[PDB]
Each structure stands twice: as structure tokens, then as C-alpha cells.
Design a protein around this ligand. Structure first.
Ligand code: MG
Lengths: 555, 407
DNA sequence: GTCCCTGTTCGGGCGCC
DNA sequence: GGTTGGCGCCCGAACAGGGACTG
């Protein structure tokens, strides 16, 4: 029908008029196909034919859809959307299977011709004018405007989700113990009822829907585990993803790689152990998406690892709010992490990875901090509370670090888990200077003009180096001097630098940086038995940061 | 309750468009309960997408309570609402409220609803309540009455406010009251106990209309300090020359010239240095300068208040307020004995903010020593106010970590 | 102010709906 | 095979800071 519901007022952004766009040419096979569509639609009040007093027009093409060789209308409102008001989008997120509680009876049903069952505000209606092209220049094509929610207009999704809500509210009031998941025109409906009476409640929903102009076709999964919902198969006591198939390709373009990372990420929600960090590195290349990136054999390792995991049967279970939430994290490679959320051992509500590089420099205890933050916010969305954690890090290490780190950092309730590898700090800086060890006063110095710099040191035992760097900078020469000193010191060293920047990076105890130099500095650091790093005011003539500075400033 | 007063967004700005963040079941159950009622009453109306604007909401139990308090983070809208929290606002800041013995913090926002909001301004007040696991789309609301948390609210309910206390005020020429937004700050020098029961007696000069502890003159300033030692080392002197160097921008007279020449050439770090005559009598003097206040630093109510914080560790956080960098209106420590790093630091910004309101009558913008992601995952779990200070996140040098060190 | 360097945000591809 | 909205993962491009410079 047309839903008896009230239109939602719509305006164009102030000062702008409608679209005046030229209907571009289309095959006669579409032009007939569109006339067929635009005739039944006209038959059913969804579109009104308009005269020459509608100034506006926007382009309407057509394309065959999904193995039917049936054409499907489609307007390009890209301009109307530009001129349409802003909206506040109401769809905030996507329902996840694991926030689903086990109900005794389940139904899934979709709403038919949903957008076309909702009235468009009449005063806005005229801006939707489109003309279906006569096979050429020949005829002024048929003019039409839209009476319902057009496909492809900026506003239609929202206004429909909104209307959907506002239509379901009455039923929801009356059936507070019927749970209805509402995604666009998709409905999951669940109850703790015997099918018979459950089934009644459903028809009772479909009658309510029908009274509002919303047809509930029969793509209704009735008494039909597996239900197919939001991408998943739902069985009565377990859920799963509908089958994933990674493109087995010969010559990967970059965008082919983004398509591969995509399926892996989606798989990563129920297949524990999915690794993607190696493949989301091949991407680090300001790019033509067309460009063909050669498969790194390290990625090669990864993909192989994954393609293998994918052959495994996995499933999740559903949420019991009686019980607690429990997350287990796993350090599973260089800044690749994995977790599972459960309420009983080996029964996985879901899983997931973290593998983000936040910072140019980071370490394990940061990342395992980041990944716990991620899992917190995710859990709030799906279950509306935060899980208990079980982490592969010993209280020891945490406190060593919550101590040396100078920006507040935190993790909740968490039990140690000896699921090795354990998260360790790879080296530690001394807190006080190392008695009797060699003391390197380092500095470096660049030349903003020639980009030429010097880095070097001067030491208490009497030795000094100066080294010249082409195409460098002050912060790299600072970092050079500290690596130079590291290279040349025994197993225990003291380093005095005037660089607030160098001090900053290293005091944070990196074990991983996008910078090869900071990585060269890290490999050394891991090799010493003790390192003390002291700072001093540059150019203030401290002994002997002034000699290092005097030798090093030939830049 | 009748007809209303015209408002406008600062000449050129557009309404708020901020996303709603995920909320816990409890904060949501609380919220639809609260908003169901304000719907029945007609303080909030239900709206849809046609309203392009949004502001975040969560809810807090203001303390150990079952009563949940709705908090709409109007931070943005307030920032965008026309200049009249200074321009049409009449309030001078009674300089002496900070001088009182006791001050009590009074929540009174639920008294703002009495007053209609301009018909054309309602839309900016829009906010969206989430559903958990996204079982439904967001449910959208708008305001028809002065909103709690909005800065235009007390700047309107003021004439009335100035009235509501005409008696109680006259009848108490030595108890001072101040209205900063949702909260009402009233305190007197009276004894510990007859103060409590004099505030309680304002609830009645209130309740007939409708509808925690904190002692001000004891937030003691925290000094900048130098380690005294019987024996010094190269490393000890180099840290000393490092601090005083810096401090020498906050205090003009601080000299380090005699100490820097004990570092004559390339000594090893742990070598001991015999402090010389002028040496010891330069830092002896320097430690005198650090006693005296900063001279010539004055609050500009026009300008922006800036708090800045450092984690010292051991539950001790040091802070400065300041408007021109280095001219700190105040400096302090939030000492906690012996531990949630994030609860700690969120509480630190509430204690400070209050002081700011109490002393200057506005709130700082904070520069926080925490990573955005981290602050944002957890901070609403420990918030307790009705105002929210602006903030931004900082990546501090470990040096300033080291310029407020005690021992 | 100019360099850097770091941290954000913002689009844009992909995934899924 | 030319259209819309959502969330997620990535990347880089744009920014905003902060420190260090400069004659
Ligand atoms: Mg230097």
C-alpha cells in the first residue's frame, strides 16, 4: 500500500534549488526495461507522471541484478543529495549474533518493497523528477516524480529506519517480552514461547505490519534453523558465519589486497587466530589501487596460515546475562593479537584480532593495553558491560611499566594467564646512573640548508667520534649520536644527551618503530645489560655536552 | 511556565553534530526511564533524522545512590551558543567565596525545566539514546525547556534565580551564594556542624519553590623544590642544573652559572663533586627565590583558563593553572596515598575544576597526560559532576615529569 | 615564523549488512 | 555496469600541536 504513516519533513539546504541534470543515453533494452518498471510503479502510486512545469531532472540508469537478468531501476541522485538537507543518521551500529540471547523460539522475516511502502514528503516530491530516455534524441522522454522513498537518495535509509521504529513501537509496547531486532527491512524476532504461540505472535506482527502498509513476503524463515541473518547462520544453540571464500589470485593488485584483508577481518570475528598485519603492510604504499604489489613471502606465510584456519569448523554461542563476560587476549606475532570472549571455557561468544600500529614507536605493553581498550568498547556495544580479562602478562611487568611510563595508563580486573608467549619488556633503562661505566656525552647537529649534519660523542674515558650524515635532520642526528654511542660502548653505558626528543622516544621503551634508526637503537638496547639515559640543557655549556657540541657543530 | 526568550548561535556557527558513544546497559536503562518521564511531562519531544544535530548523553549516579543523573554533554553547543554567558550574564565573581571556611556543592539543574526554550532553538538541543547491540536504531529527542548542562540555561533563569534567594540572602548577609550552571555554590565560615544545618535550611527556602563536603581555604599551593644532599655527584648536579635552568623561566632571578662550572669537562656520572663555596651559596640563594610567589600574575576572565597535569607516580599528580605559559595562577598536588591510574586522573580534573569555578568562576581547558583512546574508554565511569570541562590530550616530555619531583 | 616530528582527523578502498 | 546509509579494518592526505631552530 502506502503506509498510513506521516511523512518526514524534508528541505533542501538553504539557498539551493533542485537538480537540473541531463538524462544521459541508455540502451533500448534498458529503456524498455525501465518503461516496464516505471509503468507498474505508476500503476501503484509510487511514481506520479509530471508535466513540463517541473524544471528538475536527475539521471536514471538501470542494471540487471544477481543472476536473474532482471533489470533493476536505479536513479543517480548524487546531485539531489548534495542539495538535500543534512540528516542525523539513526543507524548507529550493526547487531551482532553474540549479543543475541538464546530464545526458545526464533523467526526471521524481511519487509517487502520497504522504501516504496513509505511516503515521501509531498513538498519535496518534485525534486525527484527523472525522465526515462526515449531511445535517442527523438522523443521527449516520460517525466516522473517520486511519491515514496526513492532508492539512492541520501535521506531514504534514515527516514525508513526512523519510520520502521515508529511503526514497531506499538507492537513493542504490547509485547514487551517479544524481542525484535530491526535492521533496515530485516526482522529477527525471538521469544521464550512454544512455537505454536510464538508463531501466533508473529502473524500478529505481520498483521500489524500489514495494517501499516508493510508486506512481509515469504522469504520468512519459519521453523528453520539455520536462520540466515545479517550474514550468519543461526542454529538453536550455536551460530556461525555463512561461508567465506578468499580470492585465490595470481597477480595481486593492491585493491585486490584490500579485498583480501576485508574477508579475513570479517572471518576474524569467529575464527580465532586470523592474522592480517603482514598483509596490511604490503599496503603501505601511496598508491594506484590499480598498481600491482608483489606478494611478500612473509605475507605469503600469513595468508597460508589463514587459508588453513579457514578450513576449520567454528561457531559461536549466545549471550547469557546471568553469567559474566570473559576475554582472553593472545600475543601472536609482531603486533598481531587475538582474543576470544566467552562465558564458559571453549564456548566462544565471539573472537577477534587487534593489530593496529598506534604511534611511530610502540611496545608490547602499550599494544596489549590498546587491544584491551578495543575489546572494552566492543563489549559495551554488543553486551553493554565490560568483560573480565585474562591476560598473558604478569602483574610484575605491568607495574614495572605503569611506573616508568609518565602518561596515565590502565587495565581493569585481570587474571594472569600463562598462555605463552608472555608480554615482556625487552629491555629496561636504569633509574640511576651506572657506577664506573663509560659515560658518553653525545650530540648531533644538522644544517637546515644543506640538510647535512654531524653526530658523534665525547667520553670520560677519553675517546670521541664524529660522523657526518648526508640528507639528515637535527632529530635524526640526535638519534644517530645515541646509536653511535650505543654501538661503541661496552655492556654497560651511560649516555648524556641534550635532545628532549630523543629522550622522549627512548624513555618510553620502544620495542618497535617504523624508523629503521630507532630499530637499530633498539637492537643495541636489547644487547646491553644496563643503559642509563640522562638529559641536559643544550648549549648551556655542561661538561661536557659542550665539547661534543663543539666537535659536532661543523654543520 | 508560559512564553519564552529568544536565543541564537554565536554569529556564524552552526548547531552541534556530535556522535553518541556506546553506553552500558545500566546507563541506558536509566536513560529511557528518565526520558520516558520527561516525555509524559513535555520537557523533551521525540524527533527523527530530519533534525541534523546531535549531542552526546550518558548518565551518572552523582554519588553512592540509586538516583541516576542524566548528563547531556552540551560542551559543543555551549561553545556555539551566542556570547551571553559573559555579555548578558550579570554575575561578578564574589572574590570571597574562596575565602570562606566551608563551601557546599549544590545540584539544582532539575530547576531549569520550569522555563520554556525558544521555539527556534530547540533543534540544536537534540540527542540520541542508543540501543545495546543495536537491536533498534537510535531514538531521538529534543528540548522544549531550559536544558540542564546548557550555558544559556542559568543566563536566563537568572532574574528568577536572583529572586528565589532575595529573602534567604537578605536574612544572611554573611553567607555567599554563586550560580555556575547546573550547580549552586554556597558556603559560610560558620562552624562545621551549624553550617551543614544552615545549608539544609536553604533546601527549604528552596523546596517551597522547588525542587558533598569541600573546604576552600585549604587547597594549599604546592612549592617547587630542590633536593638537599650531604654529598653531590655529577649526575646529581646535572639534574640540579636541569631543573633550575627550566625554573629560571618561571622565576627570573634563578641563576645556575656557578653550578654549571662544577661540570668542568667530561666527568663520569657517578663521580662525586665537592661543592665549592660559590656553588653552595648559589643554590642556597636559588632555593630562596623558589620560596617567593610569582609576581604579577592576574586572572583574565575574558581569556582562557588552562589546567595542565603531570603524573608523578605513587598516586601523586601535580598541576598548574595558567593563562600565559609560565605565569601560573596556581600550582598544586593531588596526593593520593598508595590504584587505578585513570580514576585517579579523572578525579584530579574534578577537584581542580571545582577550585577553578570557586576561585575564578569558570572552568579550565585541561591538557591531559593520557592517550585519547584510553581517557575515552573509561572516564565516564568515574565522573560525578554536572559540568564537563573542555580537554585535549598531551604527549609530555619526561622532563616536566621531573621539575615537580619531591623526596 | 620555518623546520621537523608526533598525534589526530578525515576521506577512500575493501569487508559485511 | 553510474546510487544511499551503517559499522569495521587499513592507508594516506590533510591538519593541529610541541620542540628546535634563526641572524
Ligand atoms: Mg643537540
Amino acid at each position: 500500500p502506502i503506509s498510513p504513516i506521516e511523512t518526514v519533513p524534508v528541505k533542501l539546504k538553504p539557498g539551493m534549488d533542485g537538480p537540473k541534470v541531463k538524462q544521459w543515453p541508455l540502451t533500448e533494452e534498458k529503456i524498455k526495461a525501465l518503461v516496464e518498471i516505471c509503468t507498474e510503479m505508476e500503476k501503484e502510486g509510487k511514481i506520479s507522471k509530471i508535466g513540463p512545469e517541473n524544471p528538475y531532472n536527475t539521471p536514471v540508469f538501470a542494471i540487471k541484478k544477481k543472476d536473474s537478468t532482471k533489470w533493476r531501476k536505479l536513479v543517480d541522485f548524487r546531485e539531489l543529495n548534495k542539495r538535500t538537507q543534512d540528516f542525523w543518521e539513526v543507524q548507529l551500529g550493526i547487531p551482532h549474533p553474540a549479543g543475541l540471547k538464546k530464545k526458545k523460539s526464533v523467526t526471521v522475516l524481511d519487509v517487502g518493497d520497504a522504501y516504496f511502502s513509505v511516503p515521501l514528503d509531498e513538498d519535496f516530491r518534485k525534486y525527484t523528477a527523472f525522465t526515462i530516455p526515449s531511445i535517442n534524441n527523438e522523443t521527449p522522454g516520460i517525466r516522473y516524480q517520486y511519491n515514496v522513498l526513492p532508492q539512492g537518495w541520501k535521506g531514504s535509509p534514515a527516514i525508513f529506519q526512523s519510520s520502521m521504529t515508529k511503526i514497531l513501537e506499538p507492537f513493542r509496547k504490547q509485547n514487551p517480552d517479544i524481542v525484535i531486532y530491526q535492521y533496515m527491512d530485516d526482522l529477527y524476532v525471538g521469544s521464550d514461547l512454544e512455537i505454536g504461540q510464538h508463531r501466533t505472535k508473529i502473524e500478529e506482527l505481520r498483521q500489524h505490519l500489514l495494517r501499516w502498509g508493510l508486506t512481509t513476503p515469504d522469504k520468512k524463515h519459519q521453523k528453520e534453523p539455520p536462520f540466515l541473518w545479517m550474514g550468519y547462520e543461526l542454529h538453536p544453540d550455536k551460530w556461525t558465519v555463512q561461508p567465506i571464500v578468499l580470492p585465490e589470485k595470481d597477480s595481486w593488485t593492491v585493491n585486490d589486497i584490500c579485498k583480501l584483508v576485508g574477508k579475513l577481518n570479517w572471518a576474524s570475528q569467529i575464527y580465532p587466530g586470523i592474522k592480517v598485519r603482514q598483509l596490511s603492510k604490503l599496503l603501505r604504499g601511496t598508491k594506484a589501487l590499480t598498481e600491482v604489489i608483489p606478494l611478500t613471502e612473509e605475507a605469503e606465510l600469513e595468508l597460508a596460515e589463514n587459508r588453513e584456519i579457514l578450513k576449520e569448523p567454528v561457531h559461536g554461542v549466545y549471550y547469557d546475562p546471568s553469567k559474566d563476560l570473559i576475554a582472553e587476549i593472545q600475543k601472536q606475532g609482531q603486533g598481531q593479537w587475538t582474543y576470544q570472549i566467552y562465558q564458559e571455557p571453549f564456548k566462544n561468544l565471539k573472537t577477534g584480532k587487534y593489530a593496529r600500529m598506534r604511534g611511530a614507536h610502540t611496545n608490547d605493553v602499550k599494544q596489549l593495553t590498546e587491544a584491551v581498550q578495543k575489546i572494552t568498547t566492543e563489549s559495551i556495544v554488543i553486551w553493554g558491560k565490560t568483560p573480565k580479562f585474562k591476560l598473558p602478562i604478569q602483574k610484575e611487568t605491568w607495574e614495572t611499566w605503569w611506573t616508568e611510563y609518565w602518561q596515565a595508563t590502565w587495565i581493569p580486573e585481570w587474571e594472569f594467564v600463562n598462555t605463552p608467549p608472555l608480554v615482556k619488556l625487552w629491555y629496561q633503562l636504569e633509574k640511576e646512573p651506572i657506577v664506573g661505566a663509560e659515560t658518553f656525552y653525545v650530540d648531533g647537529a644538522a644544517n637546515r640548508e644543506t640538510k647535512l649534519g654531524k653526530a658523534g660523542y665525547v667520553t670520560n674515558r677519553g675517546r670521541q667520534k664524529v660522523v657526518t650524515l648526508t640528507d639528515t635532520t637535527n632529530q635524526k642526528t640526535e638519534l644517530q649520536a645515541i646509536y653511535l654511542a650505543l654501538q661503541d660502548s661496552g655492556l654497560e653505558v651511560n649516555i648524556v644527551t641534550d635532545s628532549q626528543y630523543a629522550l622522549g622516544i627512548i624513555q618510553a621503551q620502544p620495542d618497535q618503530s617504523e624508523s629503521e634508526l630507532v630499530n637499530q637503537i633498539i637492537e643495541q638496547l636489547i644487547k646491553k645489560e644496563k643503559v642509563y639515559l640522562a638529559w641536559v640543557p643544550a648549549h648551556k655549556g655542561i661538561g661536557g655536552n659542550e665539547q661534543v657540541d663543539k666537535l659536532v657543530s661543523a654543520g | 511556565p508560559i512564553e519564552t526568550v529568544p536565543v541564537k548561535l554565536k554569529p556564524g556557527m552552526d548547531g552541534p553534530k556530535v556522535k553518541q558513544w556506546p553506553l552500558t546497559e545500566e546507563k541506558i536503562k536509566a536513560l529511557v526511564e528518565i526520558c520516558t518521564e520527561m516525555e509524559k511531562e513535555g520537557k523533551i519531544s521525540k524527533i527523527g533524522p530530519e533534525n541534523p544535530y546531535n549531542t552526546p548523553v550518558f548518565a551518572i549516579k552523582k554519588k553512592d545512590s540509586t538516583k541516576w543523573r542524566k548528563l547531556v554533554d552540551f560542551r559543543e553547543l555551549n561553545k556555539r551558543t551566542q556570547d551571553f554567558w559573559e555579555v548578558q550574564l550579570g554575575i561578578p565573581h564574589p572574590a570571597g567565596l574562596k575565602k570562606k571556611k566551608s563551601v557546599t556543592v549544590l545540584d539544582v539543574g532539575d530547576a531549569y525545566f520550569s522555563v520554556p526554550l525558544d521555539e527556534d532553538f530547540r533543534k540544536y538541543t537534540a540527542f540520541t539514546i542508543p540501543s545495546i547491540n543495536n537491536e533498534t536504531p537510535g531514538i531521538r529527542y529534543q528540548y522544549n525547556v531550559l536544558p540542564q548542562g546548557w550555558k544559556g540555561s542559568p543566563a536566563i533563569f537568572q532574574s528568577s534565580m536572583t529572586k528565589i534567594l532575595e529573602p534567604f540572602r537578605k536574612q544572611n548577609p554573611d553567607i555567599v551564594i554563586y550560580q555556575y550552571m547546573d550547580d549552586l555554590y554556597v558556603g559560610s565560615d560558620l562552624e562545621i556542624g551549624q553550617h551543614r544545618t544552615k545549608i539544609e535550611e536553604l533546601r527549604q527556602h528552596l523546596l517551597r519553590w522547588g525542587l558533598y563536603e569541600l573546604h576552600p581555604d585549604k587547597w594549599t599551593v604546592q612549592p617547587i623544590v630542590l633536593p638537599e644532599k650531604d654529598s653531590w655527584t655529577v649526575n646529581d648536579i646535572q639534574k640540579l642544573v636541569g631543573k633550575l635552568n627550566w625554573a629560571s623561566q618561571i622565576y627570573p632571578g634563578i641563576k645556575v652559572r656557578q653550578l654549571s662550572k662544577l661540570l668542568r669537562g667530561t666527568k663520569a656520572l657517578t663521580e662525586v663533586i665537592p661543592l665549592t663555596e660559590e656553588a653552595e651559596l648559589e643554590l642556597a640563594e636559588n632555593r630562596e627565590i623558589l620560596k617567593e610567589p610569582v609576581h604579577g600574575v592576574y586572572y583574565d576572565p575574558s581569556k582562557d583558563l588552562i589546567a595542565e597535569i603531570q603524573k608523578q607516580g605513587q598516586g601523586q599528580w601535580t598541576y598548574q593553572i595558567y593563562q600565559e605559559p609560565f605565569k601560573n595562577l596556581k600550582t598544586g598536588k593531588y596526593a593520593r596515598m598508595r590504584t587505578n591510574d585513570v580514576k585517579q586522573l579523572t578525579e584530579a580534573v574534578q577537584k581542580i575544576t571545582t577550585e577553578s569555578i570557586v576561585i575564578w568562576g569558570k572552568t579550565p581547558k585541561f591538557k591531559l597526560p593520557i592517550q585519547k583512546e584510553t581517557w575515552e574508554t573509561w572516564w565516564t565511569e568515574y565522573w560525578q559532576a554536572t559540568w564537563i570541562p573542555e580537554w585535549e590530550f598531551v604527549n609530555t616530555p619526561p622532563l616536566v615529569k621531573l621539575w615537580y619531583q619531591l623526596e
